[model samples]
Target: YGYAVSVRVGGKEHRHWERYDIDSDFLIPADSFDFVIGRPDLSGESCEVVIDGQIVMTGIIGSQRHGKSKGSRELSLSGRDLAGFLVDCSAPQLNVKGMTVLDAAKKLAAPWPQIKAVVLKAENNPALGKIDIEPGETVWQALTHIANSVGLHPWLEPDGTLVVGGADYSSPPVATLCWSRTDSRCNIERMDIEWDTDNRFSEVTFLAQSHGHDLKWVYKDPTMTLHRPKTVVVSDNLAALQKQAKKQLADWRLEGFTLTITVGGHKTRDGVLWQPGLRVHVIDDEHGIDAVFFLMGRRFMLSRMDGTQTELRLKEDGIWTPDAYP
Candidate 1:
């Protein structure tokens, strides 16, 4: 089927905003308020996000905005998928032993109805013996800590199911996005490529304090020689800081080279919806970029001026190795 963005909230379709690795948002126009429903209040309401009659996400409308004037009136809504609960709600205190990542996920996601989780691909997910989830840590953070410990990444799938695993780096490119001489190669409306070293650093150190003692983890970038060290305060677990430091260091290196493009619709030429963590071949004749890149993030957008477009964030491959991450 083709692309049709719909946000079924308060029993009607308005518009949609969907992304990867983060909470998606939806909106309802102001004109539909009075005539469509009684005052049309949608904040905190359960919503079904659909694309081409397929249920993509089951989430809640958490925030709303209203504006009315003599000639202009509009209303907008923003929220997250079931994963949003994990990101928003605090994780429960678990001072237990032999608790695996899956076990922690079960506890963290138990309160959100319809939330489900699973592990994929990689193995070696060890039991986190004698763990303690202190107060103030979000459920998502707790899960990330556990997943990162084992080199797995945690994210929500299309059907609102939580998936803790690594990226499918070996998977072949599902499709190609090109900007070149042939008309068949022009699949994007616009593309922006950026290469900056501002975020990169020579070294990174993560520090924390627990039991009146200092905990620290540091990483040195052998490729960077300028002595630009970056330190960040993190969770009290000293063991967790190694993976976090590595991940953050990789993130900084990847951020130095990014590709943002706007496509016409939400799907590839083969009728599959565009999604992150998938590979896509890119050919930019102007900038001499010809390689297979990873889709790190994507956004399905719609409006009067912009029409229907999908914003994609591309990154270098090796974003997440089976046993390590960037």
Candidate 2:
């Protein structure tokens, strides 16, 4: 493993969230630091995050911090990827009543001229008309809404492209994570599973009526044995509220079944860096999970004892694919 975690900002480098969402992160943290008079300000400068030589994120520096307990000074710097601009900046107040998926995406981020937005061309593109963007919403949130209006989600690629694309559920598994107890397996080092019901609900009932219109919409999960009913209230009209209900239900339900794992490095054995929305086959006799699962998120980490490792979170298939609900 010749690669190491680093960031290039104003000609300086730092060591690494690595999330599926637009705003990834890097941190240059040290228990000891040396400074003379004044160091150049790295804040607000454009940056590129790297693991070894691979550019993982192209972003801007967000903050820097320094601390001193004694002769040793602790200095920590942090920043986010390009999509963080969208996460911080508000959406432009433009009438996107009749814009396609990509058009609205580009126009919202157009305020920040640095980011380049593009939607992967797919078949049967739908109209992004009838969009409702709130003034309080961030550029990323609104853009995600616009893209999801069709069947895509907004995320930045490794090359700094704000891509609007759907997860290719048809794609085959990229790697097989098989955990064995006796001789064990390759491509995997450790595994952990969590069945959380904190935000999960067996039935999500969204009830809200504009001017006392009186409406109730319910989305249910038949697989759940517990009767965990979650009721959300929104005054928005029927169609939009219905869509929100669907999306929110899936969002919570997907969290119910999580597979967090540890691997030797950030990439597959084939040297491909792990990415969200990719499919992988999992064979864990302990958990009785032998089917293919979808990668929802991953975290690349390093420490004194843990050397180099990546934590992967997997979810049930079809939950990540875009549909009527984002």
Candidate 3:
């Protein structure tokens, strides 16, 4: 029952509780807020939305128009957290070799004020070589490209800080959300599970033209024996081609399970916002699923008549780490 929404535009703030829906995605390059408002003049002005006293979104207003009925105005807003601005803004060309991946990310995001701080975990910071940032690339792309090269993921915190690291599966579960046939607190209205092998490759080969001849490097996953082979073309030296092949193999080996489930509320049983990147304990005996899943994305919907619901996209624990339990 603790739900609040406030929108601030051009130094003026308004709270609306009549009826609106807010949807946010974590994997998206930018986090956005879309809802209807009563004032069309708020368009084009710098705005921010606060949910439960947290500044969830900030950016310039987008499109707005009056609704067909009286006293109804519709609005379309696009914005992101402080970290999103880095992705929206472009960076100058950068060339770094043999630099730590964390340092590279900091160098790319240093120019933006919205990025108040950068946090890197002790582990997963590998030395990168020959990172060439072409002209007109966003800071987000550059940081993520380098991070991915070393098995790291860059995500923004709610406090406008950038965190570049891999998931810490060793940590204890923060909170658990359970769903069962007899439980009423959490109801699973719809669910989907996917096992995709189309892009998976048990063996990866890298071919490149070097010094008027062809060079090749191959990497095969010993755990997988699928008959899928993939070849990637690289135009770099042998060392670079080998690096490319290793990364390609790592990516191709991780194409397994994906799950999405929709619930009937916007918050967990403990009244916390259903956000991304949180580990949840799920129990659904009907589907033979009793495991831990990381919440990757969620869509929150609010309606005046029916109520609010949340749709969640979950990923297997092994997707982030190799030691995920069974």
lDDT of 3 by residue, 28-84 (tens): 666666665445476666667767776665655555555655765554445445655
The whole-model C-alpha lDDT of candidate 1 against the native structure comes to 0.67
The local distance difference test score of model 2 is 0.66
TM-score of 2: 0.79
In angstroms, give how far residue 44 of model 3 lies from its true place. 4.5
Model 2 CA deviation exceeding 4 Å by range: 10-40, 66-75, 121-124, 199-217, 220-244, 324-326
Q: What is the lDDT of residue 303 in candidate 1?
A: 48
Candidates by TM-score, descending order? 2, 3, 1
Q: What's each prediction's TM-score?
A: 0.78, 0.79, 0.79
lDDT of 2 by residue, 85-186 (tens): 777778877766666666777777677777665655345456565666788988887877777666567777666777766666777889988887674455
What lDDT score belongs to each candidate, Candidate 1 first?
0.67, 0.66, 0.66
Worst 10 residues of 3 by lDDT: 317-326
Off by over 4 Å in 3: 10-12, 17-26, 38-40, 44-46, 69-72, 121-124, 207-227, 234-256, 321-326
Model 1 alpha-carbon drift over 4 Å, by segment: 10-39, 65-73, 117-121, 129-132, 181-184, 203-223, 230-245, 324-326
Q: What CA RMSD would you report for each candidate?
A: 5.9, 5.8, 4.2
